[PDB]
Symmetry: D2
Subunit: 371 residues, 4 copies
């Protein structure tokens, strides 16, 4: 095999999460790329050094080091300096060093099994004839693979127009070729639901009961960046979208991985690749913040997502690899920004897609500069 | 002891709902006050004039008659002309003509029992020793009196900060004196939940199983205007609050009755009166909205309600009747607009309470003009 | 007939302006009340303590002393803590300690004559038959009393709708009884023009040539707080209005004294008092601002002032002194907030008058507490 | 010679302006392309037909005809349907029919001389060695060529950072080769000043006294679309920019020709071509609308223009003709949107350049489809 894996995490904490995260990473010999920020205290740097004494291939480049790498690649203004968007630095660094597997995690996720890194290496098994899951409505609820109380829930980013009729959707499994390049692992405790669902029923994930699935062509499901492995080929299409763009005056937030999860998914299907959902499952403790503020942050993106997802199914792309496909995707978003109709599509909402498309090319242009 | 009842409904439809609503109203000799708007087609007037042929005590004052009435009360600018706020015209007319019971309804509710008016006449039974319900957390979930699928839900306007711990709250019933002047009837089909709950679980209320309760002092529950009887004494405090005020730039909507229900509730309790929940139950069919637009409209008011409800418990009021208590409440809101802190309390959100307090005094000023 | 004068200045600088300002103040034995802010460096306190060694009756209450004072007056939230609105603290202290004349100045004005305090004591001369100036259009351009290059200009706050026809307006002087309680001194160098005029022609006031005038009843002119003496009776109506309220989404700024100057002007005229323009003239050097930012700040208030001034002429007031007249003015503003029409009168702009009216009552409520 | 000229005007009026505009156009045999809108009454169509009886080569394509041409060229959503941006239709139509000179005028401009069309044919004289005007600050005040009362003024779109020092700027004329492709004619009566200047001094253009100038390389001046001739080669770079994009929440307006005037100017200088200012001069009567509303509309663009103009001088372009240069300009604006710094450069302001750049390519892509 001889597979290299790099875990990418951005944080502003003191580094205490490394105590319950390092053992699973250092046992598999995987590299951990911790991306600090301006508002990151010197305790995280000391915590990374201490865990490197204990035998962890951890790196924590200071904001000075990060700005130099982005400066050489002619992208000094691409990544903001007070946001979790800085995880793109860890994406770029792991892609530069040439890792096979890039695992994107948050600083509050804990692996629940010993084979955490091994289960994420499924994106490097290549194309096999394997059971792939299809849905008559083109959507798959990966939260249905879990035991959730008090009621059924959809993951964050799942389109709202498809939820009422999804209970009638036919689900079939067929033995077909598939090349898994993205593996989204599930989460116990507080699942990855949007702020709307969390305020309504406060879901609780008890256990992973549904196993693992591989979605077929035409069946989609939102992919996150808190427990997801991405093959280095698919990483150019995994650019964490920059937030802050106002929709009808209200800036969107906390949806960078919803767009990247769909974008790397659309790009993978154009190249005949698939997305996997299931194991490894992480421990995600419950929240502790302002859920009404989370709602006010997520609504601007939620108002647009259903329209953007519908137009992406009708926009065929081009490209031989992920860089060419992701750029063809950026041009598709600019055409979508002028065709889509709706009350939430004020001039600033349409301009959100146009600036995002430019930032997506600035990301790929920096990757071509590396190569 | 002949009790007179007036039903207030504002609508822009052609008047087809009168075909099914008038039977239960004319069987009790009750008055129906339909309040049309500017865009209300001339077909509603034909339905009202024709349903009066069948014995319905219905009125439908055109916008010319509504504005001539509001001119003489020195309040021409109080009520907007493209909003459901125009139901205040119906409240004013019934209180002018001297009805004992004012039943507020929407144009899509349907009485499910033949005793609809009689069950709403409970707000005239006077004070007597009756079983009253109290709660350790000071909140009562009226939806718990219903059979709701797929999971438990809270009514629209229920404070979000008290929802997680409400399951542990103790509920007791004690024989205590109480005077019911507000009776909020429940609703089958699509229950009155906020847009957050409806997007999440799409609730369906199957039956009324919990019976009727009378809330005690210090126990609150949101009261809407879709199926609520208000005694003529309590009506001055039942002013339907005017929407449209921006909160951090986003205008609020669909919460006029949420503020009115709490305001008439706090005023009733200060005067020794109580609110009742339960019967009569109406049929509110599930109407397919733009639920994302409903969410975008309700979030501005939701961001402030939790703070507003907490301060209204700390602020004692003054007044002998509802007219004096409602004015003291308006001065209390202006004191709250400067006391309160939070991220959602930008200068426009604070000025929303100040403009609302002035409009409430304008509403009571017109009632003092009539009386 | 010993008259006491207090100069009120708020600043965030290091206190270098005291080197040139204190001579004219300590030569007249006048009191200087410097009001620092949170971000005011500790160098200002050394300049005040040291200028008192040279005989200056100066005080500089820290933010701790300012908040302790405002706590006992039940107005802790009245005055923000990062605004020039904190000069209201200086108005409060001088009115508390009982000074006859309160001279409002900025930290960049410089008296050009040795009789600065004496010329400002004109607001204590009492009522006498004196030449008063009237205008056929009801407006007087105080900048016409100055020599301004390169062209004629209007002061900041002058209504725009009356500017084109003001050249045809007739000006007459008549021996009439008048009682001056407000004296607005003029300014050489950079005149007090709005950001619109300054961006256009960059005015430069070379000399004071028109002398002094006393405006008659029905003749108005904006009064600022950069060089204005207010008698202690008129000070309750001189509350520096709080900025920040959004007009159609855009927050207003730099117009607190424009509203205060008109408010104390309308209140003085209802009580039979007059406003004076002319001497003493200060040296206001041209300070290079971000003039585009100044324009963006002043436009919100400018969009409303023309409508507000027109309605304030139609609304008669009540009151025996300034405390009762200023409160009647606040109730008049709430009546105007609903009467007025225009494109710039979105719900947030109307609620700006309602919140301002409450803050004015809070200001007078604290003065009633002191007295 | 054998020169064809097409005058482009968009309007919503009844067509009365054709009475005083047709004689100068029909005498020279020039085509007039009147572009109506949705809110255009049938009187303009009758007025165009009547003037065609009198011998005017006028055309007035209905909104149905306009949408078909844009539909064939795969640009159905490029041009909005309630704006003067529809003059781009007249630009495209005259470019399709192959006119040498395209004269862009407003419906309220009247030629003051008989040689109006002949003086605008100067953009077809080709390159000659002629006196070109240079300025040490790189800016030229074309309003200095007029007699303006009561004081000197700058044209709309002139950068504000350069105005104070422009009085010291050296002006020299040198005999050098120049190919005039854009000729901006001046205007008597109400000049083309921004809303800031018009509210301050209300300028009045008395006569054209300065003659005509041809700006050299590096010397710029804003160009408008109300009295300007554009050679068909330079027309691809004359796309009237679409307004409505919010800057810090405030949408910009009335600045479509300010950006197009600078863009066709920058593109012309890259190709060695020049811009001419002077004759022919038109009659522009005084305004009649809400000048405060004009200010509120123009400020969002004014806050950005000085920054955009500075970066355009430091961004070298590419291209052999105007189509290639205008597209290279669109990519330059996207790089400028991420390099520029300022308080007014909120996320929606930066996204204004990105969407504008996409619309500029959609314009050129439609022109390449025509060819
Ligand atoms: Mn988390
Ligand atoms: Mn309904
Ligand atoms: Mn100053
Ligand atoms: Mn014009």
């Amino acid at each position: 095999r001889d597979i290299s894996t790099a875990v990418v995490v951005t944080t502003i904490s003191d580094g205490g999460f490394l105590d319950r995260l390092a053992p699973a990473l250092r046992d598999a010999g995987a590299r951990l790329i911790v991306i600090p920020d301006r508002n990151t205290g010197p305790a995280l740097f000391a915590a990374c050094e201490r865990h490197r004494r204990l035998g962890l291939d951890v790196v924590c480049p200071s904001v000075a080091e990060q700005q130099d790498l982005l400066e050489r690649l002619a992208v000094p203004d691409l990544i903001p300096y007070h946001s979790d968007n800085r995880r793109n630095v860890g994406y770029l660094m792991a892609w530069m060093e040439g890792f096979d597997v890039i695992v994107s995690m948050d600083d509050d996720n804990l692996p629940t099994t010993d084979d955490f890194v091994e289960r994420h290496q499924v994106v490097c098994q290549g194309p096999r004839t394997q059971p792939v899951t299809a849905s008559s409505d083109g959507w798959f609820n990966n939260c249905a693979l879990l035991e959730v109380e008090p009621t059924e829930v959809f993951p964050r980013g799942f389109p709202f127009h498809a939820r009422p009729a999804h209970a009638q959707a036919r689900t079939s499994v067929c033995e077909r070729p598939a090349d898994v390049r993205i593996n989204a692992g599930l989460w116990l405790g507080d699942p990855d639901v949007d702020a709307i669902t969390r305020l309504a029923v406060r879901p609780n994930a008890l256990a992973h009961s549904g196993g693992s699935v591989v979605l077929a062509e035409g069946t989609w499901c939102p992919v996150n960046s808190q427990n997801t492995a991405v093959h280095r080929d698919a990483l150019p299409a995994y650019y964490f979208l920059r937030m802050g763009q106002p929709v009808d005056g209200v800036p969107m937030e906390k949806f960078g991985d919803i767009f990247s999860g769909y974008f790397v998914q659309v790009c993978a299907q154009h190249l005949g690749h698939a997305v996997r959902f299931g194991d490894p499952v992480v421990e995600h403790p419950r929240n502790e913040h302002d859920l009404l503020d989370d709602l006010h942050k997520e609504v601007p993106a939620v108002r647009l997502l259903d329209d953007i997802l519908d137009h992406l199914r009708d926009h065929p792309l081009e490209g031989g690899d992920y860089l060419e496909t992701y750029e063809s995707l950026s041009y598709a978003l600019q055409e979508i920004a002028e065709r889509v109709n709706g009350r939430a599509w004020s001039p600033d909402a349409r301009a959100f897609l146009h600036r995002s498309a430019h930032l997506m090319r600035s990301w790929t242009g920096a990757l071509r500069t590396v190569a």
